[PDB]
RNA sequence: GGUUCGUGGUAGGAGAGCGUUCUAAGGGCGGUGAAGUCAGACCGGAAGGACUGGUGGAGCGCUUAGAAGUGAGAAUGCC
RNA sequence: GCGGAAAAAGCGGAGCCGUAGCGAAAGCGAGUCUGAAUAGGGCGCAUAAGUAACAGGUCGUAGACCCGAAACCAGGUGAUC
RNA sequence: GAAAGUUAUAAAUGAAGCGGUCUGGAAAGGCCCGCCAAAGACGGUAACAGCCCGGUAGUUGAAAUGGCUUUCCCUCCAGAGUGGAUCCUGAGUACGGCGGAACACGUGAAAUUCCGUCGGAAUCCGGGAGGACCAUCUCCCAAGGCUAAAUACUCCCUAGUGACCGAUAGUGAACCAGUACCGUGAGGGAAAGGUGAAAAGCACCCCGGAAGGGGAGUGAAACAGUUCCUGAAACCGUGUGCCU
């Protein structure tokens, strides 16, 4: 596919490695692999305190027998009003990993699938001499983006991540860091050539 | 109640019936009341018969 | 993101008993009606019959384990067939292959299936068969 | 916390390829006089852990 | 798409769904009036869902997925 | 566990399950055990699919669907009745 | 003991719209134009604000005290080889019997470790252990002491987070709560949040002793009137279309 610079001018062409941008989508695993990745984003920190836990209980209200009133064991019994609660949520972690193969299977997909739709912008450097976040507003028209994009980048490149941070719908990430939910979350996904370059050689 | 010269003293355990029912009890030191001077002065201390046994005051 | 479907049938919905008649678990929630197995962490343990003396205790026990048992990875003559002709297969080639992954005592051959390339298989242990075949083959059985 | 193996079960039983239980016979200690030589021959045997007993005690041997 | 035989039902098994709170992502509504609340002769096979008008005065749907403190008429239930 | 954003990968093969069973065991092994047996019979093989993860059902250990005793034990508080 | 550095405990500076117009009580909202961004965190502001305010990114800052890290001061200090005459190498100790306990191990064939009691070694030609025990071999040298880190927990402090609660929930306690109240005492132990953007919290008149009303006025609204957002149901009334 078409390799053209930060200005937005053409630069050849780029050939992308078939067995990461070319193989057939597998939905069902990127589905699996994107559930999976939010539920152990979850932090799991919410509790109740059941009929043990609340303050004071103790003794029981009154005699078993006698007074005509219904049979009760402790004020912080579940039917009570202050009561405890019954079972409700305890700390829990969310977190699973599909099996590694299923894994990279779904990074392989989700890759492919911007391919095939055309979501998928190789830029040949994209650098900045300083930080300057209007330079990159520009650079976005230049591209002609005006979505969410994920923008994957391996040159230290400090005053790209700088430039993109105050933009909304944008997100710099190493290329190391190229997650199936990152790629799920942006419409558009700009990668540099020698980002590429370290993708496939993980892939 | 507690030897001067050992640190020996009562310690609990089990008595133990056949049939194995268990119920707490304790082992005394064989504590003997004697003049020694540990310090430069004597004095009536309690010393177990096992501190006794070979060199000791009295 | 907005258009998620899990693959058809590995994902139910699960059953919430005691949440009204209409759904057929209401009320009673699946129990029936009274005893011990109609109570709150009801139920007797697992292999108990009611006072009927258990199955385990009706059969006596049996053997003892010994201490000092071997147990030998077993490699079948059909795996060799893998290795090249004319090949020296050693416990380490068969790890590195990964044909035996942990060598538990030691690496037995045994004769199940038939063997076509000429080897010479270094092993802990043989079956006759496995002697016999390698050889009918025209390899040399070496016992380390 | 995992499940514990009945170890009375343990002692007793064995796992067969297919994956039944096998067991040996109870009326095999003592009172000899009172079995004939083929109820001895027959009880010396192993046998098969039934269905309906397999199915009440499969939980208590799972490993 | 037809044909044939079926479709009373407690315990109970099986299936498909409704609605509630929260999350994500898309896409919306809302001071030209959100939610709630009140009324009605509307719609769906049910759970249920709209529309219109009053009150209300600022937040709330919808779609697809996900997660549950997810549905009450009875407990001499608790307030 | 290292690495890292309470990330994602990567690294980490120790271990686990499966790929062979039979026998109390020594052991032998597509067989093996019993047996003097080349017999018969038991369990196996001839009739390979497992494993990892998630979801449903059910079970086990946990209060384990919720409410309810009379009681038991431990440390205290009471002879202003 | 100093000195230097650094962190903490106050702070400082900090870009860009009074943009036009629509609705409105009010504009941060709609429509139409701009602009800043290492700052589009969060909150506030008469409805929803990167550009109105406090701020935020970034960049600066400490007289004083405390912590930390360095360096200096100060203080302290012998360590290799060769023989084996002799000497030393933890005694009521190890161990054993009896009685207990700890060991996953219920006295068992019961090693190992500890307690009470009684008995009681060897001591380099020595001693212990390898799950009764003996022999061989192997590995170790008890009966003296010290020792950071990796581990546990959180009354606290700082900064944050949540497919955690949202006033019968969440702490017992959002409110002067371990209060009120109950109990001789130990102890038990509540209920109870919301005027409005702003008090502009209703001058004045009228009935009434007052309370409370009705006007008038404020306000977007007073059917928002000092407990005052919404205001369901039970329950209590007035009126009347049809029936009795
Ligand atoms: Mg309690
Ligand atoms: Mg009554
Ligand atoms: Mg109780
Ligand atoms: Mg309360
Ligand atoms: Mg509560
Ligand atoms: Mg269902
Ligand atoms: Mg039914
Ligand atoms: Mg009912
Ligand atoms: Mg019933
Ligand atoms: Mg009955
Ligand atoms: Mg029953
Ligand atoms: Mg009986
Ligand atoms: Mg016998
Ligand atoms: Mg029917
Ligand atoms: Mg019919
Ligand atoms: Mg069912
Ligand atoms: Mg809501
Ligand atoms: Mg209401
Ligand atoms: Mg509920
Ligand atoms: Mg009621
Ligand atoms: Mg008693
Ligand atoms: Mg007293
Ligand atoms: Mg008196
Ligand atoms: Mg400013
Ligand atoms: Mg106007
Ligand atoms: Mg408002
Ligand atoms: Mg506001
Ligand atoms: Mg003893
Ligand atoms: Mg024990
Ligand atoms: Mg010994
Ligand atoms: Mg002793
Ligand atoms: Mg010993
Ligand atoms: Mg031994
Ligand atoms: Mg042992
Ligand atoms: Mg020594
Ligand atoms: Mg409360
Ligand atoms: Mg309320
Ligand atoms: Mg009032």
Known sequence: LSLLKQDGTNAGEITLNDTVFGIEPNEKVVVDVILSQRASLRQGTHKVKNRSEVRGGGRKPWRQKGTGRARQGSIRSPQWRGGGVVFGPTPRSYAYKLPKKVRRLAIKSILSSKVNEEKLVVLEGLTFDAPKTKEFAAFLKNISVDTKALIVVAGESENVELSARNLQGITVIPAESISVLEVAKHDKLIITKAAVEKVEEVL | ?58 | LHELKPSEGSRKERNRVGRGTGSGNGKTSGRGHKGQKARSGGGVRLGFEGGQLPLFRRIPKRGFTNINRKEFAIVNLDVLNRFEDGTEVTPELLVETGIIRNEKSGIKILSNGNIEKKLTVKANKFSAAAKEAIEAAGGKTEVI | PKMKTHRGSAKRFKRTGSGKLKRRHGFTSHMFANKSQKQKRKLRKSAMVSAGDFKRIRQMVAK
């Open chain 2, 1 to 58: 109640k507690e030897c001067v010269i050992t640190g020996r003293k009562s310690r609990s355990g089990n008595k133990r019936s056949h049939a194995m029912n268990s119920s707490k009890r304790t082992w005394k030191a064989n504590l003997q009341k004697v003049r020694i001077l540990v310090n430069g002065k004597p004095k009536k201390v309690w010393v177990s018969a096992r501190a006794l046994k070979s060199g000791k005051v009295e």
